[PDB]
Amino acid sequence: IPDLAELETRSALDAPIPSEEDKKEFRPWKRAADRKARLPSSRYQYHPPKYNRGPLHPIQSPPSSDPIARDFVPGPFNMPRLKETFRTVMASDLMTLAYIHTPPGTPKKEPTERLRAWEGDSPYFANRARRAPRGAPELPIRERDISFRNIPEIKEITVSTFVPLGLKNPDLLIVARAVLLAMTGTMPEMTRSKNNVVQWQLQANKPAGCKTTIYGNAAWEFMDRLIHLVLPRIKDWKGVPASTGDGSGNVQFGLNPEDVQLFPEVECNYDMYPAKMIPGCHIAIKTTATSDRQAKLLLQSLGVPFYSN
Amino acid sequence: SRIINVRLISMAMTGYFYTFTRPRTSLPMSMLKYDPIVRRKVLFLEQK
Amino acid sequence: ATFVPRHRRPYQFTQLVQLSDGSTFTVRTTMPTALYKSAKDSRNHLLWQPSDKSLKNVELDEAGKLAAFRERYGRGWDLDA
Amino acid sequence: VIAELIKEKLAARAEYNARQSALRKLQQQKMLARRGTRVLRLMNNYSYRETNWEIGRLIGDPGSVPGTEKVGSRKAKFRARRRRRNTFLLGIKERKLAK
Amino acid sequence: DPRIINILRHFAVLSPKRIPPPLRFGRNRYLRHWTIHRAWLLFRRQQREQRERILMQQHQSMSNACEELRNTEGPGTRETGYLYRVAMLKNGVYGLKSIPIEYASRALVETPGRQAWNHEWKR
Amino acid sequence: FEESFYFYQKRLNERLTAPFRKDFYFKKDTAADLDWRIKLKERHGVPAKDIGRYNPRGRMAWNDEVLVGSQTSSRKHMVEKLLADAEMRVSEDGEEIPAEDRVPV
Amino acid sequence: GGPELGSRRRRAALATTGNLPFEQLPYQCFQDARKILQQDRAAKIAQIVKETEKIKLIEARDASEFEGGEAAKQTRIKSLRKYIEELKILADINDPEVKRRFEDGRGDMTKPVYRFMAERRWRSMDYKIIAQRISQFHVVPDLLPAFDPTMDVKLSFRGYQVSPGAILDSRVTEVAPTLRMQVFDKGERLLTVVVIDSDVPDVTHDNFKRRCHFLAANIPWDPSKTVLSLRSVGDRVEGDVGKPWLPPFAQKGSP
RNA sequence: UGUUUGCAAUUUUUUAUAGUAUAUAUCAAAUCAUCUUUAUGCUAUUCAUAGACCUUGGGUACAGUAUAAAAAUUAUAUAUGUAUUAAUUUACAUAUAUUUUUUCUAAGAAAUUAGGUAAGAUUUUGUUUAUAGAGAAAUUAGAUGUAAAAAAAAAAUCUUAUGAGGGCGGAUCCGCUUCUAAUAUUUUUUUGUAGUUAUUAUUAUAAUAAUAAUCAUGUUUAUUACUUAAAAAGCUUAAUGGCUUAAUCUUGCCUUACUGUUUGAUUAACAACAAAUCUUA
Ligand SMILES: NC(=O)c1ccc[n+]([C@@H]2O[C@H](COP(=O)([O-])OP(=O)(O)OC[C@H]3O[C@@H](n4cnc5c(N)ncnc54)[C@H](O)[C@@H]3O)[C@@H](O)[C@H]2O)c1
Ligand SMILES: [K+]
């Protein structure tokens, strides 16, 4: 076939598997020793720049996927058992549970302008500025239906701490930053206060907390630890409040300082921290959902109890 | 006052100078300015 | 000139998690422990297993007083059922 | 093969260095003559003196500010830094081998 | 102070000056990684296409069944689409007791427990 | 391929993550520290138990890839090593338990 | 062991290592990845034979049979051909040696695979430059209402490469330049070259006129040719020189 | 031998060969501090050996399930030993004061720095929903929508053109002028709306039709383009205007916050003059 004649004649992909005899004779450690010298360096010595100086600069930076890049992060190390669970059993139950049948020839719904315009016979309406968002001061995202093309999933988790007393005892901020480190496996970024309150002895623009964001597989692993190993150990725990939700599919709740040390990563070396310095955290679970009821329906699929309050 | 007018002398020993202001509690000024006598950019240092 | 920051990640291990049910899965954590035995987890909690009869009708004497009394005076005085 | 190839690398390195030093010696001779040349001109009242603008171009032609160029190459610093480390480690091998 | 110094050392090791540098590969080593990356992203495509194929096939089975249901009459003296209009209700779907926590709490595991399944469960 | 890939990325993480500080989890001269040092020497200094023997730093750091037909990357060898590291190797008094008197997990 | 083998590291590595194809290095992850791409390339080729025969069925099909007429039969084969072109690239885009052969300049430009990487490489750094010169120097709309270059054109005077828009001396720009062109479309086409000076001052009417300094037509070109010396366009290369090279120049005072 | 050790992979330049301008190699620089002892220690085992398990000295190990064959190897000052020599000579074992491996007390935890230029980011405030301690009042997370295979073709309404050097009157000057081309506008006359995956139906695994999905060869934390009322925040300082496509913010390098002369204006600055303001060469 002429089309197949345009493909590369010599294909590495269509080569036979390596020979066992060749495998036996391939010893990378014996080459460096037998050489008894240092092989000359290659003339290609491009190294990613430390700064991005524009799209037209002679020296350009590679993408993060490039292993030599400065922002490269080693890929997945395992499959979070809660992501395989959700995609294996709970992906179709939520799709089947919440399903509305659309007839075959249903006309596509046309979205109406959310920033209305004035229409009428008054000459003033012509050049009037678009009206304000009706209801809330900011337009809320419209809920999408749970389809086979839109399955709510967990996206990222933000663990934040606020230590006001750390302004007087600087060590309260050092411990808080370490607990949030072992808990999530990343380096928290210090935050600062934004208001001034003398009654609470709060001064503005001073480091008073820390925050980490875990994405991808890390966020699915953290959820499992929280659901199956931390929350089941909180004494007299009722469940996540049914009122949680910002109206966009994100669930927020907080842990006590005595419940933060239940994390296996914090109870192992609990004695290495000064007494009464482990803080409480604010866990914000951001999902792909677009509603409060969808997120609460998503978390219930992962084994989160919710109580009325 | 809080501000003082300092004079930057040309190190080419041409006699040209520039005059700028800066707070008292600051380090002496030292800049690379243009000398019209030699028509080249030389080092200018504060007088005192 | 936008600085290209680098990721600052600590050392991470691979851990075997053995739930109270005896089932085992592997995770990625920062602690050096290799095997994490969980004596109390969702597989043993009543809020997650409201139907299992074994978990209900449990003494749950967290303080220890209910057991100290029986050691001193015996099981003569009990809520027999 | 590795030993001989390195000799070719050093031979080509010496050629450039030999030419560079052979040319660097010429520039230092051209600059010396320029900075040492005194052109006295008939200015006024039958007086003779070297113009101030010519005194400014003695250090170098206009366009750049002499004394602002980078003194050396960072590659030579990496090259030099490796050489220093190799001795240090190689030196410890001789000592702990002497013992 | 001693314990806080330990915590501070933990951070001193994570500073940009202490963390290891970016990798430095040759060509054959870089090309070796280029394929491992080219084959992994393609593997995810094969898993993404398969996963999204099952979701579409399971979804089409619902559309077909519900479309048939819409045009049914019965059982008995019940107008067309009664069962359809009753099946599209979402009573309690978005409540607190929607999904049983015993089914959602049980996640997949690498190896089973001492008692994989409980057959002696009684109502 | 999924197994070989994870192992391949676990060794790149060894070259890019901060070192492990045992002083942050174990305190000197304790039953846990001594038990950690003994088993750490059997792993040839590698604090991780599922990446075989690989030194991120040094002259031989480049040899991170594993040859075809290897057992180290498999999941059977992973569980075997993580279990052999869970058995208590140091008695309550700080002495290493005899090889025959060690109870497996 | 001569320079014809490549860099020094290659000549050294090629004498202290074993003789073995790069694709047969016994590495675990590298060979597991090579098998995923192997059985996938076989699925892309199996698809090219499926879509190749699906065109014959549509070709030997009366237009009237199609409810859309002859117009609906060409849009169906037009899409099938385009879908096959993509399968011929995805069959080698993951090949590690096709990437090496291209980066070394030894790539066969008569194949769609190497022409795809060349355009992607050109559209990464070089296109963004020429796209910027056309706008900042106002080549558009002065010369053309709209212009989106699709081929690479690098000009060099006396063997010295010229950066786009560099002010050259009147002595350098005295002989015909050499154009290092590169096309990324299949087949052989006829090319016309035109050098226009768009800033000739016309003081008699207070405006600028455009003057042609070179014009040649009927220049055969293929994606395999790279160099074209405008000096020899009548004898060496085939073409018709409508106007020989006129040395550029600019009178004193004009921009 | 700077640059990762299995092999022509970035940009520019030097030099040389072949070559008649091209091609290869080489050199220097740019981008980047990757850490480099090929084993001198350690580990195991095995011989001897005065020795009642240990003393002293030698061997051995053959390495892809990589290995004992380096998971991090300095240099000393003193004291206390032990064994040693012509000799505090030398080799070890302890401790305690050092320096070395840049390798372990978070500046990427702090500082409100304001001009020139380049790149990057583009609603930052308030409001509001929710959130351990947390309350009227502390922090954090959020808060618009659309699109991303590809079009082809007919006429008309204008508007432009340094397009055809159009034609006619007085090549590029001018008011009338046809034709072609481009932008915009019509809801316009339409034609086409595939391919791929899947479902359903007929037909004999394929073909045809219909329905749904479809930016995706790519680190899904996707990305890119467009859209997202007004006010507010920010912009040295009041107030008004303005900027969000930069005049704001972040970062790199910088100090034109230069010297002389000078153009045209502020319907001929302030209803004169002068000190002024903007601007050109
Ligand atoms: N990712 C893409 O390139 C892509 C392409 C087309 C469409 N989409 C759309 O985006 C949605 C999500 O994209 P996705 O399905 O490719 O994401 P994904 O599930 O494949 O990736 C999720 C995260 O986990 C990692 N991961 C993936 N597979 C893994 C495994 N087997 N083991 C361990 N870790 C693994 C990935 O690296 C990523 O960080 C798709 O459902 C589709 O709607 C994405
Ligand atoms: K996938």
Ligand SMILES: [K+]
């Ligand atoms: K700046």
Ligand SMILES: [K+]
């Ligand atoms: K707004």
Ligand SMILES: [Mg+2]
């Ligand atoms: Mg400013």
Ligand SMILES: [Mg+2]
């Ligand atoms: Mg805000």
Ligand SMILES: [Mg+2]
């Ligand atoms: Mg006046």
